[PDB]
Amino acid sequence: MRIVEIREQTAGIKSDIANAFIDFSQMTCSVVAVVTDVVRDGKPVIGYGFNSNGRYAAGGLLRERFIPRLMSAAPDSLLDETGENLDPFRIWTRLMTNEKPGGHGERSVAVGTIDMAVWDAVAKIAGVPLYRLLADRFRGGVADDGVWVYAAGGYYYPGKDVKALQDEMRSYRDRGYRVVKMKIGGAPLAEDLRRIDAVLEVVGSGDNLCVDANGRFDIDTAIAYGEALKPYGLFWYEEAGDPLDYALQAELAKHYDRPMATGENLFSHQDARNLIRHGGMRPDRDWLQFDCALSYGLVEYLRTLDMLKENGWSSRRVVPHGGHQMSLNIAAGLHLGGNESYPDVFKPFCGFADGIAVEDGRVRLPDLPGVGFEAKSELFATMSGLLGTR
Amino acid sequence: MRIVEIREQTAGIKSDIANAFIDFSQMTCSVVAVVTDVVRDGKPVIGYGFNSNGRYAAGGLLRERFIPRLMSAAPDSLLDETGENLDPFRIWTRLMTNEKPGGHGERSVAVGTIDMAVWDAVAKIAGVPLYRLLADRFRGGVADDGVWVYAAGGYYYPGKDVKALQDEMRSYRDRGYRVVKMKIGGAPLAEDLRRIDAVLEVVGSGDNLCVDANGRFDIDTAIAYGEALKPYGLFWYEEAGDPLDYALQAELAKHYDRPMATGENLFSHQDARNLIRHGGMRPDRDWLQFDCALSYGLVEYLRTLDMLKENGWSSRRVVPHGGHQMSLNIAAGLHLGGNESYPDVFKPFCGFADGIAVEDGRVRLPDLPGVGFEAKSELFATMSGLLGTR
Ligand SMILES: [Cl-]
Ligand SMILES: [Cl-]
Ligand SMILES: [Cl-]
Ligand SMILES: [Cl-]
Ligand SMILES: [Cl-]
Ligand SMILES: [Cl-]
Ligand SMILES: [Mg+2]
Ligand SMILES: [Mg+2]
C-alpha cells in the first residue's frame, strides 16, 4: 500500500466580516486530498484536510515544496511498523526535511493541512473514528464521551448593529451552545461595552460570554479594556495583545485577575513553549488556543502537549481555535478542554457532523471512520468537487 | 508617477552543500521587479529585489496575496509627500493590510523582497546610492566610509576534506577578507575540531574564525561544543541552539563567556525583541544577525533598530545574514556593525559591486544610484533575464 498522490486546491471563504485586526474580504483556505491505494467499502481511501480561517491558503508552499518532497520519498518509507497503514511521524519527518528552524508561519499551514489528511486516511484504513485511534494509541483506550464547545462569532460587519448581534447570539443558543464569543477592539470602548451589554441580555451570566481582541491592543489599551471588562465577570478575555509579545500578557495578568486566553497565532511547540515560559499565563485559570491545522499538524501538536505536561499545564486548559472536526477528534481522544465552533461563519468550512446536535454546550462524535468529513454533506461535496475526487 | 507593474520569478540556487540542519539541493529564491513610469538616464526606473538563501522562494505568496494588494491600490496612495517618489512606509502598510499577527515566516520573505525593490527604486528616483538616501533621511547625512565584512562558507559537501576547506578559506583571504566563517555540527565533534584546526592553519588567530551550528544543538551538545571551542578563542560561536529557544541561549551564556551570535532566523521586530528580552544576549560582546530581506524589509528593520536602542543595544552589534547589497547599504547608511559576505556560495546571488575590492575586511560602496545591482554584471543579467527587463 502507498500514498498514490496528493492533490491541493484553493477555496474562498471571503466576506466583509471583520475583527479588530483584519477583515475577511480576501480570505482563502487550502484543501488537500491524500489518495491511497487502500480499498474500504468498495472505494479508495482518500484522506482530506483543510486549514482554518485567518491565515489564507498555503497552496504555493504545498505545490512548490511539500507535496513534491513527500511524493519523491520511497513509498515503503512512509508506512508504519506493520506495513499496513501510513505513519504520520515518518511522513512529518519527510515533509520537514531541508527546512530551516524558525519562521513558523505559512509553511506551518501547509504541513498542518497535509497532516490532517494523513490522519484522516490512517483512521479510515484502521476503520475507526480518529478520536478512537488517538485514544487507543495515546490514552490507554480512554476517550471522552463528548466535547465542550462554544459558539464563536460576533464579528463587526457593515450595517450590523446590536439587534443583529443579539439575533446572531440567540441563534447560537437555540442551536445548543451555552457560551458564545464575540469580537472586541474594532470600535471605541463605549460602543464595545454597549455590544457586550446587548449580548448579555441574551445569554445571561458573564459566565456565558467570551471576548476576543485579536491581538490588537497595546498594553495601555489592554489594561483599560480589562478594567472595563472586570465587572462583567466574563468567561475569558482573549488575545488582548500581540500574540508574540509575551511580556505584555505577563504585565496584563498583573492587572486582570480573571481568565484570559491566547495562542491561536502561535504555530509551533517552540512558540507555544515561549508563551508558557515568558507570558505569565496561569495554569489554574487561563486557556490555550493552539490550532493543529495551522501549526504543522497533530504530530507537532503532540510535542506541544508533551511540553505543556512538562511545564505543569493540563491538556484540559487547551481549547483549539478553528472550529474543525480534526480538533474535535483530538479533544476527545487526547483529552483537551474543548473546541471552538463556528455555527455561521466560513461556510462550509465550519460545524461538525450533520444531524448530531450540540446539547447544552457539549457535542458527541460520530462513530464513523476518519475525521468525519463525509458526515458533513455540504463540506464534503465542496472538498471532493474542488479536489476532483467525486 | 506610479508603479506600473510588479513582476516576480523564481531562481534556483541549488547545490549539495550542507550545514548542520539542511542541505541546499532544492534551494530557490524569489526575484522581483518594481516597474515605475519614471525616467532616469533615458530608461524606466525599475527597482529590483531578491531574498537571501535558506528560506526558499515565496512566489506563491507574492502572486496570490502581496502583488495584487499593491496593484489594486490607488496609485497616488503609494507616493510620498512630494508626489515624485514612492513611500516605502505607505507601501508596507498596504502590503500588510488584512494580515493577522504572529506567523512570521514565508510571507516575511515575500514582503522583504518587494521592500528591497521599492527602496532600490526610491534611491534611483532620488539619484543616489541607497546608503546615501538612508544616511540623509535617518542619520543626519552621516554615512560610514565603508563596511566591515567577513567571508562565510565552510559548508560540508560530499568528498570535501580538510585540504579543500583550507583551499577555500585561503581563497577568501586572498580576496581581502580577514575573518572567515565555517559550519559546525554536521559531523562528530572530533571531526569538526580537526576542520577548525585545519582552518586556523590558514587564518592564524581564532580572532579570524567564526563557527556556525545553524541552530542544531540541544543544550548539552551546545555546552559540550562550547567547552571544546573555548581554547581556540573564536571570534564568535553562532546559532548554537534553536533560534526560538531563548532560554537555551541564556543558559549557554552561563557556560560560554566568549562572543556568540544569533538571529538570522528571526523574521520580525517582535521575534527580535523576544531574543533581546529572554535570550541572555550580552550587548557588550554578542552579535545580532537579523536579515531584512527575510524579515518584511527595511521598513520593519527600522522598527527592530528602534527596539534595540530602547533595550540598550547598539546598532554596531548588528551584522546581517545574507551577503547582499541591500544590507551593505543599510550598514553604511544606518551604522550597523558590518555585513556577512559569500564569495563562493549561491552564485550569482552573492558578492558586492564588480571591481571594488575588499581590503583587509572592509569594502566601500559604489557611488551609483540604488542598491547597486547594475554594478554586478552576472547578477543583473540573471535577474533582468528572469524578470523580462533585459
Ligand atoms: Cl477582534
Ligand atoms: Cl495567539
Ligand atoms: Cl457552550
Ligand atoms: Cl552548520
Ligand atoms: Cl532562499
Ligand atoms: Cl574580515
Ligand atoms: Mg481568536
Ligand atoms: Mg548562520
Side-chain angles (χ1 to χ4, degrees):
Chain A
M1 68 154 292
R2 71 174 66 199
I3 295 174
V4 176
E5 59 176 307
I6 305 176
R7 302 182 187 172
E8 64 80 34
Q9 189 49 284
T10 302
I13 44 168
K14 297 180 185 181
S15 84
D16 289 335
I17 63 176
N19 63 40
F21 217 105
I22 72 161
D23 78 42
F24 286 73
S25 62
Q26 306 160 20
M27 196 55 56
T28 57
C29 66
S30 289
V31 301
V32 165
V34 170
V35 182
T36 78
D37 61 355
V38 183
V39 173
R40 292 290 181 267
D41 291 307
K43 311 222 186 60
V45 170
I46 301 171
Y48 294 94
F50 71 89
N51 70 273
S52 314
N53 82 89
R55 303 318 299 206
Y56 300 91
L61 282 144
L62 285 166
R63 75 186 70 96
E64 300 164 26
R65 303 226 293 275
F66 295 98
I67 291 168
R69 188 185 279 148
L70 187 55
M71 291 310 303
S72 58
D76 286 351
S77 71
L78 306 185
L79 307 184
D80 71 18
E81 70 276 353
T82 75
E84 284 305 335
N85 208 334
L86 307 177
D87 188 329
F89 301 89
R90 289 178 189 258
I91 282 164
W92 199 95
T93 297
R94 178 61 176 189
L95 282 164
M96 288 304 286
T97 58
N98 291 327
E99 294 285 330
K100 278 178 74 179
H104 302 309
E106 312 291 329
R107 65 169 190 196
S108 57
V109 180
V111 173
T113 304
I114 291 169
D115 170 283
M116 181 178 307
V118 166
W119 288 98
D120 185 39
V122 170
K124 285 161 159 168
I125 292 168
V128 291
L130 180 58
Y131 78 80
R132 174 47 58 194
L133 190 96
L134 297 181
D136 285 354
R137 293 182 183 190
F138 300 107
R139 297 289 183 267
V142 181
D144 294 329
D145 293 341
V147 176
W148 178 69
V149 294
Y150 71 96
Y155 284 81
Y156 302 98
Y157 189 83
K160 182 179 185 180
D161 53 18
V162 288
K163 181 55 172 51
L165 173 63
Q166 288 177 321
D167 290 347
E168 176 187 4
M169 300 305 199
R170 190 180 311 280
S171 80
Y172 297 162
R173 300 263 295 187
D174 286 351
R175 279 177 273 185
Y177 297 91
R178 195 202 288 185
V179 179
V180 307
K181 183 167 84 188
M182 58 188 290
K183 303 309 196 174
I184 56 166
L189 176 59
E191 189 174 6
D192 276 342
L193 298 177
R194 178 172 143 90
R195 291 167 66 256
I196 287 164
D197 291 337
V199 169
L200 292 173
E201 287 176 16
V202 178
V203 304
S205 177
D207 293 352
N208 297 327
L209 184 55
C210 301
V211 295
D212 188 353
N214 279 100
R216 184 66 284 177
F217 297 156
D218 60 15
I219 185 62
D220 291 337
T221 304
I223 295 171
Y225 264 78
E227 295 304 327
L229 297 168
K230 276 176 184 179
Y232 290 103
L234 301 174
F235 193 78
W236 75 49
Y237 174 16
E238 172 174 336
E239 210 178 31
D242 187 310
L244 293 160
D245 192 346
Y246 304 128
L248 184 163
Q249 178 62 29
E251 177 68 26
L252 178 59
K254 295 175 181 175
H255 301 272
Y256 188 83
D257 65 6
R258 296 154 205 268
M260 292 190 274
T262 193
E264 76 190 49
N265 287 310
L266 303 178
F267 304 123
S268 69
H269 82 274
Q270 292 95 329
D271 291 302
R273 183 173 61 206
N274 289 333
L275 174 68
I276 299 302
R277 293 175 166 166
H278 307 300
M281 302 286 288
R282 300 160 300 191
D284 72 323
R285 77 188 71 178
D286 296 331
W287 302 96
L288 306 174
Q289 301 176 302
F290 314 128
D291 181 348
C292 71
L294 307 174
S295 301
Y296 308 92
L298 174 56
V299 168
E300 178 72 0
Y301 214 79
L302 291 166
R303 300 179 181 114
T304 297
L305 292 180
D306 288 339
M307 179 278 297
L308 293 180
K309 180 181 181 58
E310 291 153 18
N311 288 267
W313 278 77
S314 174
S315 61
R316 295 303 192 185
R317 303 316 298 176
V318 181
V319 181
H321 169 274
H324 50 76
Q325 287 165 303
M326 181 69 179
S327 287
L328 192 75
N329 282 277
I330 298 168
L334 296 188
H335 309 169
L336 308 183
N339 192 26
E340 185 173 36
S341 187
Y342 304 123
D344 280 7
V345 294
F346 312 125
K347 290 182 177 181
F349 299 94
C350 62
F352 313 119
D354 297 344
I356 298 180
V358 176
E359 301 188 47
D360 196 29
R362 296 178 44 81
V363 73
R364 78 171 185 90
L365 286 68
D367 197 351
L368 292 169
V371 167
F373 295 106
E374 291 77 12
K376 295 180 60 56
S377 187
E378 186 183 344
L379 174 59
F380 185 72
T382 291
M383 292 181 70
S384 59
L386 285 164
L387 291 157
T389 56
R390 301 261 187 89
Chain B
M1 66 155 292
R2 69 186 177 115
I3 298 172
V4 175
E5 61 180 303
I6 303 179
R7 304 179 183 172
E8 63 80 30
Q9 188 52 276
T10 296
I13 47 173
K14 302 181 183 184
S15 81
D16 289 334
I17 64 179
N19 63 40
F21 219 105
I22 72 160
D23 77 44
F24 286 73
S25 62
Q26 294 298 325
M27 195 55 53
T28 55
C29 64
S30 292
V31 299
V32 163
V34 167
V35 184
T36 80
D37 64 353
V38 182
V39 176
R40 289 290 179 269
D41 302 319
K43 289 185 184 174
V45 170
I46 301 174
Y48 293 94
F50 70 88
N51 71 274
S52 313
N53 83 89
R55 302 317 297 207
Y56 301 90
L61 283 150
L62 288 163
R63 287 185 306 270
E64 296 173 12
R65 300 235 292 277
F66 294 102
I67 291 171
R69 257 174 216 148
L70 275 186
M71 294 314 299
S72 63
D76 279 1
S77 73
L78 302 185
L79 303 185
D80 72 19
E81 297 156 339
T82 78
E84 298 302 329
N85 210 335
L86 304 177
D87 189 326
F89 302 88
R90 287 176 187 267
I91 285 167
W92 199 96
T93 296
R94 178 66 174 194
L95 281 163
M96 290 298 291
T97 290
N98 296 322
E99 293 287 327
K100 281 177 75 176
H104 303 307
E106 313 290 330
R107 64 166 192 197
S108 57
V109 177
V111 173
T113 306
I114 295 170
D115 168 283
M116 185 177 304
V118 167
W119 288 98
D120 183 41
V122 168
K124 283 161 164 168
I125 291 167
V128 291
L130 178 61
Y131 78 78
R132 172 50 57 195
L133 188 96
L134 298 180
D136 285 354
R137 292 184 183 190
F138 299 106
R139 297 289 185 266
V142 184
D144 293 331
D145 290 344
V147 179
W148 180 70
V149 292
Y150 71 95
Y155 284 80
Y156 303 96
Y157 191 82
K160 183 180 185 178
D161 54 10
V162 289
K163 175 59 189 138
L165 172 65
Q166 286 176 323
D167 289 349
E168 173 183 9
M169 301 307 198
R170 281 195 190 282
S171 79
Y172 296 163
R173 302 260 290 186
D174 289 349
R175 278 177 276 184
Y177 298 89
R178 198 200 291 184
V179 176
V180 305
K181 182 165 86 185
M182 60 188 285
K183 303 308 197 178
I184 54 164
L189 176 56
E191 187 172 9
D192 275 343
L193 298 175
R194 179 168 148 90
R195 289 166 67 257
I196 289 165
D197 292 337
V199 170
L200 291 173
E201 292 173 19
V202 178
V203 304
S205 178
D207 292 350
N208 297 326
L209 183 57
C210 303
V211 295
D212 184 355
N214 279 97
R216 183 64 284 175
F217 299 154
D218 58 22
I219 184 66
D220 289 343
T221 304
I223 293 176
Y225 262 80
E227 298 303 325
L229 294 173
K230 277 175 186 180
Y232 295 109
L234 297 177
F235 193 72
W236 75 51
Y237 173 17
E238 173 175 337
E239 212 182 28
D242 189 306
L244 288 162
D245 191 345
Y246 306 125
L248 184 162
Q249 179 62 32
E251 177 69 24
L252 177 59
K254 300 175 185 160
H255 299 264
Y256 188 87
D257 63 355
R258 291 189 172 273
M260 290 187 273
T262 192
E264 76 189 49
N265 288 311
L266 302 181
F267 305 124
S268 70
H269 81 276
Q270 293 93 330
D271 291 303
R273 181 172 62 209
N274 288 333
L275 175 68
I276 298 302
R277 291 173 168 167
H278 309 297
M281 301 284 286
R282 305 159 296 193
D284 69 313
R285 74 184 68 174
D286 292 333
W287 300 98
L288 305 173
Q289 301 174 301
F290 313 129
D291 177 350
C292 70
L294 303 176
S295 304
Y296 309 90
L298 176 55
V299 169
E300 178 72 1
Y301 214 79
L302 288 165
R303 298 181 186 115
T304 297
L305 293 178
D306 290 340
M307 180 278 297
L308 290 182
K309 185 178 174 66
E310 290 179 14
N311 285 275
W313 279 77
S314 176
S315 60
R316 297 300 190 187
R317 305 314 302 176
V318 180
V319 180
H321 169 273
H324 49 78
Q325 287 167 302
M326 181 68 178
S327 284
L328 194 75
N329 280 278
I330 295 165
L334 299 189
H335 309 168
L336 304 186
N339 195 24
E340 184 174 39
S341 187
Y342 304 129
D344 283 4
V345 293
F346 311 126
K347 290 181 178 183
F349 299 93
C350 60
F352 312 118
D354 297 344
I356 296 179
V358 177
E359 301 184 82
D360 196 29
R362 293 180 46 80
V363 73
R364 77 174 186 88
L365 288 66
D367 196 351
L368 290 168
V371 165
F373 296 105
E374 290 79 11
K376 291 181 62 59
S377 172
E378 187 182 327
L379 172 60
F380 189 68
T382 294
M383 295 182 63
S384 60
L386 283 174
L387 292 155
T389 63
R390 172 163 55 193

